[PDB]
Design a protein around this ligand. Structure first.
Ligand code: MG
Lengths: 235, 169
């Protein structure tokens, strides 16, 4: 099939994300996978990763939540944690997707990412409705969310509007409230109370080859930086 | 800003060679070891220890720290350019966050740089784009295949047939 690579990372406050111990850390991931399951059957079961496919199918953590603690590795000196799970589906075309959650002391490595987000495009019926659902999830369980974005791989890596800092992508979350007319026409604002708003750039999935979808996110990030909202790439 | 009376060019020159012993793989003949020795010119199983981290090599005249990665394509799906979802943890530790640590410790820049040489093109294209996403400015990735591999036969195919496409155009 002819799918496209997509990025789905959300950055959290590195200062107070470390304050969570290994107990409350596991509970938020647990509440996130519980949120992921009703979106598609492929998101129902999650496993530990492994050096081999045979190894990575040995620990179903949805069936046995007692082994979720085995995913989280913690350094005692720096107090950084990381946790990696995966779909149990081997083929990215059929929805195969891993979950990468790391809470290091640095803002560049305090993130949650779904790799690769293009697998969810090959399986979601309405991608916009399902993609925002796991957004509003993340932000309910993690109040420390500083930034979020969903965009294709070729666009951010090579055609990002401003290379020195991040982007809003197709759907991103900025931790402040926004005015509607400060943005292009068909960019939808859903103001969540307390932590900011979420910006959607057209309910159809972005195409880096369409000049329209190019300018929407372009003219966006120009605004997003005009108000001082676009955070730097390195922290 | 300022930069004067420079006492120590290349701080990583104060490192040392040592046996790795990272619970890796032994034997001098594996593709992992032979590729590492060709990129770094370090005798197996010696590596470079500086600033508390391990580096595969160190080009002192260029003040560039080297790291070589051989067999990793089996954790990616070839045609799609993405890793296999079950190998995310191994890709994260061995390829991504190890390069993030290399970038953080290779300072000041200039003169301290770091390069990652990949035997396989498929592994190079994924990682190099990941480093650009993380903004590792002092880290450069290369597809540097070794003579004798089948990856080298594919490399000289396109670098000898790019001079047939970048000439008639
Ligand atoms: Mg190796």
């Amino acid at each position: 099939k002819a799918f496209r690579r997509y990025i789905f990372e959300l950055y959290f406050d590195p200062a107070r994300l470390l304050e969570l111990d290994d107990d409350q850390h596991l509970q938020r991931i647990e509440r996130f996978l519980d949120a992921l399951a009703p979106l598609h059957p492929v998101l129902e079961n999650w496993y530990l990763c492994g050096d081999s496919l045979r190894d990575a199918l040995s620990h179903n953590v949805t069936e046995h939540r007692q082994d979720l603690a085995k995913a989280l590795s913690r350094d005692r000196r720096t107090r950084a944690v990381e946790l990696v799970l995966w779909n149990g589906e081997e083929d990215p075309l059929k929805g195969g997707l891993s979950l990468d959650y790391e809470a290091s002391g640095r803002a560049v490595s305090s993130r949650l990412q779904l790799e690769d987000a293009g697998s969810l495009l090959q399986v979601f019926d309405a991608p916009a409705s399902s993609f925002v659902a796991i957004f509003l999830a993340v932000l309910e369980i993690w109040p420390e969310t500083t930034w979020g974005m969903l965009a294709p791989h070729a666009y951010f890596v090579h055609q990002r509007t401003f290379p020195d800092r991040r982007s809003i992508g197709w759907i991103g979350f900025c931790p402040h409230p926004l005015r509607a007319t400060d943005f292009p026409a068909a960019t939808e604002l859903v103001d969540i109370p307390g932590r900011g708003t979420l910006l959607l750039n057209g309910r159809e999935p972005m195409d880096e080859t369409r000049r329209e979808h190019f300018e929407r996110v372009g003219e966006a990030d120009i605004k997003l930086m005009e108000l001082g909202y676009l955070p730097p790439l390195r922290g | 800003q300022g930069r004067d009376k420079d006492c120590v060019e290349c701080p990583p020159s104060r490192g040392e060679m040592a046996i790795a012993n990272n619970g890796k793989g032994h034997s001098m003949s594996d593709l992992s070891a032979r590729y590492q020795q060709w990129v770094t010119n370090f005798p197996f199983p010696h590596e470079w220890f500086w600033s508390g981290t391990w580096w595969d090599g160190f080009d002192e005249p260029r003040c560039t720290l080297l790291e070589a990665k051989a067999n990793y394509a089996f954790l990616f799906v070839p045609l799609l350019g993405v890793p296999r979802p079950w190998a995310r943890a191994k890709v994260k530790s061995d390829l991504l966050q190890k390069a993030e640590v290399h970038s953080d410790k290779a300072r000041p820049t200039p003169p301290v740089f770091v390069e990652w040489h990949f035997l396989q093109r498929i592994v190079y294209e994924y990682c190099a784009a990941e480093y650009l996403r993380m903004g590792l400015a002092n880290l450069k990735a290369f597809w540097n295949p070794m003579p004798g591999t089948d990856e080298h036969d594919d490399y000289q195919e396109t670098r000898a047939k790019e001079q047939e496409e970048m000439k008639r155009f």
